[PDB]
């Protein structure tokens, strides 16, 4: 067999440089790379694994049918160990088939409906493939999607709490679909954890992506942008001025039940908004964003109570449940009690007189805790400016920049 | 510090599983620990994560969810009844013994802050013990209590280095 001697010929080429030409023959396929090599594949990985083992798997998951025998469970076990001990920098030179391998694995787990074993797989691959923790790869979308199908939101938090500033070119490919998927599945993840402040931020980034045609993954982000903004803020926030023109001309007309919902959510009237929700209920349940409109119902009552603090200082419970349409002093008693615990209002309930007194005196700025709070905001801005200066300096030393 | 050392020990065990499903007692511990930390959203998602087949197999898991449903509605007088409707084995029992205290202290803080006057009937259902607090609270904690009308009246009870960092940044 000439293949066995050829393997040793690869060894003498490696470890003495010539890394560029090594990748040259990798992209030359190899006629399925002798897929029946599984018997000798165990001993093929000499030393502490090599890059060649990663190349072959990337091509035999795309057989378009029956990828890796009914024995997939056996192979996936070796794949799990492969990522955990591959090591080295050889993978970074080939950041086009590792991501492709991750896409094939993500597709496999989705069809078999087991989106929990791949969470521990697409968590160390990202950790070493990216240059730094602030670089967005094409595997972030897959990891967020996997933890979204099987609901384990906590593991994906460390990869959503960091501000992405770079996008991996991945040796070509990397279309806008992967970028939108990360900033849309991240929005769902934050929405589930009831973090609407950052969920709104993620949906906005997807909308502002430059585009020339309507996509299915961007259509259901303007819709959720409105609902999240209605829950967190009192109204629909204004989109950035540099948004793509496709959203203003094509995306908006399809999303007309949500726009009408915003129109009703401008004059406070829960009864009217209740009718619209039950009228367009078929649309809100088809898009699977049901249970995010029911929260808009609750938020209307809480917004109106938060407005009573702008005009009143002591209000009877019976009188309070007449402007907000709560229909009962007992119902209004628990609504206020819930809001105090959340921190959305400062008030105290006097059950003897059946009154609610709105304190509206949270804190004076004379605390050492507030001094530390301001300092924490200082360090975020100071360190953010440093990374802006660093990326600015690299522009100055660019050979293209100096010419003009 | 000692308690935190045990918290993170159970976290990773669910992630690595031979087939994506862990042993039943591991599932139950995570759900009960979520209740103790008041993290209701992840507790609800964990219940949705458990496959229906194992969910019906072990009714011990359902007992945790019935208690979790009450605390999800913030039904203070109702959680104390659901925590005793079922009997938990000694392997999970100490965790419930700490959730009950956490709920008890949570009601005490909420009443003292969100209420200026509360009926003794309602306050007892909140704190959980309508047994001996009726007479002990008058003289020890100092809260004046009036009978007949049953009204309780809660009462309220190194830098130089940082500064030179700011200037060294601003001037450069």
């Amino acid at each position: 067999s000439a293949l066995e001697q050829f393997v040793n010929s690869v060894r003498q080429l490696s470890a003495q440089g010539q890394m560029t030409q090594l990748c040259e023959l990798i992209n030359k396929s190899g006629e399925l790379l002798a897929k029946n090599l599984s018997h000798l594949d165990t001993v093929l990985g000499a030393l502490d694994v090599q890059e060649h083992s990663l190349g072959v798997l990337a091509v035999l998951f795309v057989k378009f049918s029956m990828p890796s025998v009914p024995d997939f469970e056996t192979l996936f076990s070796q794949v799990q160990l492969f990522i955990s001990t591959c090591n080295g920098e050889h993978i970074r030179y080939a950041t086009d088939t590792f991501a492709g391998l991750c896409h094939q694995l993500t597709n496999a787990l989705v069809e078999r409906k087991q989106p929990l074993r791949g969470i521990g797989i697409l968590k160390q691959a990202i950790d070493k493939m990216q240059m730094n923790t602030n670089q967005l790869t094409s595997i972030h979308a897959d990891l967020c999607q996997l933890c979204l199908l099987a609901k384990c939101f906590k593991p994906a938090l460390p990869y959503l709490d960091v501000d992405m500033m770079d996008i991996c070119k991945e040796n070509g490919a990397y279309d806008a679909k992967h970028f939108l998927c990360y900033y849309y599945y991240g929005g769902m993840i934050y929405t589930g954890l009831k973090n609407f402040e950052r969920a709104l931020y993620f949906y906005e980034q997807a909308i502002t992506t430059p585009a020339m045609a309507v996509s299915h993954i961007m259509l259901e982000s303007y819709k959720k942008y409105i609902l999240v903004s209605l829950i967190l803020l009192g109204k629909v926030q204004q989109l950035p001025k540099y948004t793509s023109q496709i959203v203003g001309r094509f995306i908006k007309p399809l999303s007309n039940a949500y726009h009408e919902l915003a129109q009703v959510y401008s004059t406070n009237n829960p009864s009217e908004l209740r009718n619209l929700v039950n009228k367009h209920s078929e649309t809100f349940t088809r898009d699977n964003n049901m249970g995010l409109v029911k929260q808009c119902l609750s938020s209307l009552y809480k917004k109106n109570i938060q407005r009573l603090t702008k005009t009143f200082l002591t209000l009877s419970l019976q009188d309070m449940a007449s402007r907000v349409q709560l229909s009962g002093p007992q119902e209004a008693e628990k609504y206020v009690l819930h809001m105090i615990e959340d921190g959305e209002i400062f008030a105290s309930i006097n059950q003897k007189d059946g009154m609610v007194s709105f304190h509206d005196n949270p804190e004076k700025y004379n605390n050492p805790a507030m001094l530390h709070n301001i300092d924490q905001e200082m360090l975020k801005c100071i360190e953010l400016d440093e990374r802006l200066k660093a990326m600015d300096q690299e522009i100055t030393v660019n050979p293209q920049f100096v010419q003009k | 510090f000692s308690f935190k050392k045990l918290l993170d020990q159970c976290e990773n065990q669910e992630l690595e599983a031979p087939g994506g499903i862990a042993t039943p007692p591991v599932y139950g511990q995570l759900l009960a620990l979520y209740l103790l930390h008041n993290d209701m959203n992840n507790a609800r998602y964990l219940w949705k994560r458990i496959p229906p087949a194992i969910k019906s197999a072990n009714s011990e898991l359902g007992g945790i969810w019935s208690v979790g449903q009450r605390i999800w509605q913030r039904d203070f007088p109702g959680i104390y009844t659901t925590i005793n409707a079922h009997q938990w084995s000694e392997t999970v029992q100490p965790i419930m013994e700490a959730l009950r205290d956490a709920t008890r202290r949570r009601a005490f803080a909420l009443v003292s802050q969100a209420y200026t006057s509360i009926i003794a009937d309602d306050f007892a259902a909140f704190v959980g013990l309508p047994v001996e607090e009726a007479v002990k609270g008058i003289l020890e904690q100092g809260w004046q209590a009036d009978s007949t009308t049953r009204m309780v009246l809660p009462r309220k009870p190194q830098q130089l280095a940082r500064l030179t960092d700011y200037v060294a940044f601003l001037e450069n």
Partner: peptide
């Protein structure tokens, strides 16, 4: 102050070197 000044002069030194090279 010395660190910031050194980095500022280091960038200015590098840009001038590549500028002089192609100036005949």
């Amino acid at each position: 102050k010395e660190n910031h000044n050194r980095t500022q002069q280091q960038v200015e030194a590098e840009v001038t070197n590549i500028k002089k090279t192609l100036k005949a």
